Design a protein around this ligand. Structure first.
Ligand SMILES: [K+]
Ligand SMILES: [K+]
Ligand SMILES: [K+]
Ligand SMILES: [K+]
Ligand SMILES: [K+]
Ligand SMILES: [K+]
Ligand SMILES: [K+]
Ligand SMILES: [K+]
Ligand SMILES: [K+]
Ligand SMILES: [K+]
Ligand SMILES: [K+]
Ligand SMILES: [K+]
Ligand SMILES: [K+]
Ligand SMILES: [K+]
Ligand SMILES: [K+]
Ligand SMILES: [Mg+2]
Ligand SMILES: [Mg+2]
Ligand SMILES: [Mg+2]
Ligand SMILES: [Mg+2]
Ligand SMILES: [Mg+2]
Ligand SMILES: [Mg+2]
Ligand SMILES: [Mg+2]
Ligand SMILES: [Mg+2]
Ligand SMILES: [Mg+2]
Ligand SMILES: [Mg+2]
Ligand SMILES: [Mg+2]
Ligand SMILES: [Mg+2]
Ligand SMILES: [Mg+2]
Ligand SMILES: [Mg+2]
Ligand SMILES: [Mg+2]
Ligand SMILES: [Mg+2]
Ligand SMILES: [Mg+2]
Ligand SMILES: [Mg+2]
Ligand SMILES: [Mg+2]
Ligand SMILES: [Mg+2]
Ligand SMILES: [Mg+2]
Ligand SMILES: [Mg+2]
Ligand SMILES: [Mg+2]
Ligand SMILES: [Mg+2]
Ligand SMILES: [Mg+2]
Ligand SMILES: [Mg+2]
Ligand SMILES: [Mg+2]
Ligand SMILES: [Mg+2]
Ligand SMILES: [Mg+2]
Ligand SMILES: [Mg+2]
Ligand SMILES: [Mg+2]
Ligand SMILES: [Mg+2]
Ligand SMILES: [Mg+2]
Ligand SMILES: [Mg+2]
Ligand SMILES: [Mg+2]
Ligand SMILES: [Mg+2]
Ligand SMILES: [Mg+2]
Ligand SMILES: [Mg+2]
Ligand SMILES: [Mg+2]
Ligand SMILES: [Mg+2]
Ligand SMILES: [Mg+2]
Ligand SMILES: [Mg+2]
Ligand SMILES: [Mg+2]
Lengths: 73, 101, 88, 119
RNA sequence: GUGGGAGAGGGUGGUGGAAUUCCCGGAGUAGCGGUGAAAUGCGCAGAUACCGGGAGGAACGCCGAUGGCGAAGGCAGCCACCUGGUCCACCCGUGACGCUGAGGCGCGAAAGCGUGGGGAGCAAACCGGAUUAGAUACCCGGGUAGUCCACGCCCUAAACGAUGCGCGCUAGGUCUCUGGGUCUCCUGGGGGCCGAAGCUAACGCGUUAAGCGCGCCGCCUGGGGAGUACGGCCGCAAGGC
């Protein structure tokens, strides 16, 4: 049930409010460009709420995607 | 006076000359809006996660200013006027909400 | 909005004695400050009803405090108003 | 005839029919098929079978242009989407990849009554 | 008061991508659409499916919750400005300045009304296709008002927790949002569930009371006639009280 090491574990310190850290933010998006749930992010209510605001900033800047196509099916 | 962060994405092309012309209109405009550039980060051109203005890349400029609130919006306008200016996102500064550390 | 200094200048300008922060005079001064600034906002943004309730409340509290002075010290009261600029 | 050798295969699944479109590397159609092109004309166009035939018709027609390998692209849900995916693979055509690209709005247009009250 | 905090609370301007429709260009050909099955419909004036360019309107996927904010109605992309409420800590200032609240005034989903604008999708009425014993319906293809914006009206609702507001008192357990601390746990404010005592016709409620008490407002008094008639007030009308 979504158990493959939460994205927070496999990662170090990072400014959750930094909308430019693509290499870090990129981690919180799925195969698609969708924001991973908390079961996967591992973040907390308060953290996750800031992740979202951050990511949505990245997207508008073009640094991050809104949607991805799935390779398989 | 309040502290912000001006984000600007430019045409990933243009010669070393024109690039400096936009940065000329930027500075110029900035000052005209009480822009005290406390920092900058010309990160350069980067591949976008999606094509912006038909192009798959853009030239990113980051700053950090202090200026009169009642004008942030105006400034933002003035900036977007140029064509080579494809993005302008002014975000009110904020202390880093560290996580996992 | 309203900065500390703006606020302070007010508290000091009305304190009954150094250190006075919660005296009826001070409170009513502060309210009158918020009230004015808020009534200014609502001149422009007429449809911002939610905020307007806040205004109704502030105008309430001010009235009740001012009513208190009136009852305890009818002088300090005529004093305060004349100073600020309330009651008509 | 024109010779492409390598291109794309689009599968438009629907609960009413499936239709396949083969295209050159730039997305311009070369040939196509569907439950209607083959015999079927009523509710059978939706059938997984119809999708199969439509898929094979497409490939063959695209053999005439000397095409050999394709990049499958799937769109929509629909009885018989997967049969197409399979019909192609097993048909001379080399399936280099399969990619689901069904369009989904970030919520913009109000659905017809028939497709509301969802979620 | 001072210092901190969280939030889809409200208003104005800006702005981002996905999708639908339409227009333009390409490539391509016989159907597409639709249903239980069909037909109406659209397509060789080349539709459907596919790529590229453009215009416009409306709504914001994932995050998203069993979550949060607000007095209620209600509030969800992102940015800035203006602005409301509220919680915690420190015990710093005033010194009962308090509670409730007939009337008044303001706010108040949707539909609806007026003037002007906008109109992509959806869609009362309406035009058609099916279905049926019939089908002024359910299903299918169209489609006007409307839905959207502004300004002004209307004032309703299963406007619901079907539970008026404030304060004090009465076991705990457990999950959760948000703040402080000596941070296993303690402590304050909010959201849930199980439950002591107790209450309840029962169902159930149970520190978020429907328990034990005080204060103030509103309301009920068998069913139908009837939320009707009359009068009055309000509304442009519809119609409201
Ligand atoms: K943290
Ligand atoms: K809608
Ligand atoms: K026909
Ligand atoms: K079709
Ligand atoms: K909720
Ligand atoms: K109407
Ligand atoms: K509206
Ligand atoms: K109104
Ligand atoms: K803590
Ligand atoms: K009992
Ligand atoms: K029950
Ligand atoms: K009761
Ligand atoms: K009457
Ligand atoms: K009136
Ligand atoms: K009248
Ligand atoms: Mg069909
Ligand atoms: Mg404070
Ligand atoms: Mg807090
Ligand atoms: Mg905080
Ligand atoms: Mg809000
Ligand atoms: Mg065309
Ligand atoms: Mg015909
Ligand atoms: Mg012909
Ligand atoms: Mg034509
Ligand atoms: Mg042609
Ligand atoms: Mg089309
Ligand atoms: Mg197109
Ligand atoms: Mg538009
Ligand atoms: Mg139009
Ligand atoms: Mg509440
Ligand atoms: Mg509700
Ligand atoms: Mg506030
Ligand atoms: Mg004290
Ligand atoms: Mg004393
Ligand atoms: Mg009251
Ligand atoms: Mg209303
Ligand atoms: Mg209303
Ligand atoms: Mg309406
Ligand atoms: Mg109208
Ligand atoms: Mg009109
Ligand atoms: Mg028109
Ligand atoms: Mg329709
Ligand atoms: Mg219809
Ligand atoms: Mg009127
Ligand atoms: Mg309810
Ligand atoms: Mg006890
Ligand atoms: Mg415990
Ligand atoms: Mg706590
Ligand atoms: Mg609690
Ligand atoms: Mg709740
Ligand atoms: Mg018992
Ligand atoms: Mg009871
Ligand atoms: Mg019983
Ligand atoms: Mg209980
Ligand atoms: Mg009580
Ligand atoms: Mg009554
Ligand atoms: Mg009777
Ligand atoms: Mg009635």
């Amino acid at each position: 049930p979504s158990r493959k090491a939460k994205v927070k574990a496999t990662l170090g310190e990072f400014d959750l409010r930094d909308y430019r850290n693509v290499e870090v933010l990129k981690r919180f998006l799925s195969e698609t460009g969708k924001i991973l749930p908390r079961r996967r992010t591992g973040l907390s209510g308060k953290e996750q709420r800031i992740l979202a605001k951050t990511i949505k900033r990245a997207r508008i800047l073009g640094l991050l995607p809104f949607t991805e196509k799935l390779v398989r099916k | 006076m309040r502290r912000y962060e001006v984000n600007i994405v430019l045409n990933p092309n243009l010669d070393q000359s024109q690039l400096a012309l936009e940065k000329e209109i930027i500075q110029r405009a900035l000052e005209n809006y009480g822009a005290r550039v406390e920092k900058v980060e010309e990160l350069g051109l980067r591949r976008l996660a999606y094509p912006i203005a038909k192009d798959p890349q853009g030239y990113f400029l980051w700053y950090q200013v202090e200026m009169p609130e009642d004008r942030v919006n105006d400034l933002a306008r003035e900036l977007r006027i140029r064509d080579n200016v494809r993005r302008v996102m002014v975000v009110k500064s904020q202390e880093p909400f560290l996580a996992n550390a | 909005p309203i900065t500390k200094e703006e606020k302070q200048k007010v508290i000091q300008e009305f304190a009954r004695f150094p250190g006075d922060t919660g005296s009826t005079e001070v409170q009513v001064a502060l309210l009158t400050l918020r009230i004015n600034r808020l009534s200014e906002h609502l001149k422009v943004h007429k449809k911002d009803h939610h905020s307007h309730r806040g205004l109704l409340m502030m105008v309430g509290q001010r009235r009740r405090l001012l009513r208190y002075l009136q009852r305890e010290d009818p002088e300090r009261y005529r004093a305060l108003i004349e100073k600020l600029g309330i009651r008509g | 005839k024109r010779q492409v050798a390598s291109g794309r295969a689009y599968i438009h699944a629907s609960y009413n029919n499936t239709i396949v479109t083969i295209t050159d590397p730039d997305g311009n159609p070369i040939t196509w098929s569907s439950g209607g092109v083959i015999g079927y004309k009523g509710s059978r166009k939706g059938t997984p079978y119809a999708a199969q035939l439509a898929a094979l018709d497409a490939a063959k027609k695209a053999m005439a242009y000397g095409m050999q390998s394709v990049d499958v692209i799937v769109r929509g849900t629909g009885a018989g989407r997967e049969q197409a995916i399979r019909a192609l693979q097993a048909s001379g055509l080399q399936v280099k990849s399969i990619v689901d690209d069904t369009p989904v709005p970030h919520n913009g247009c109000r659905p017809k009554k028939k497709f509301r009250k969802a979620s």
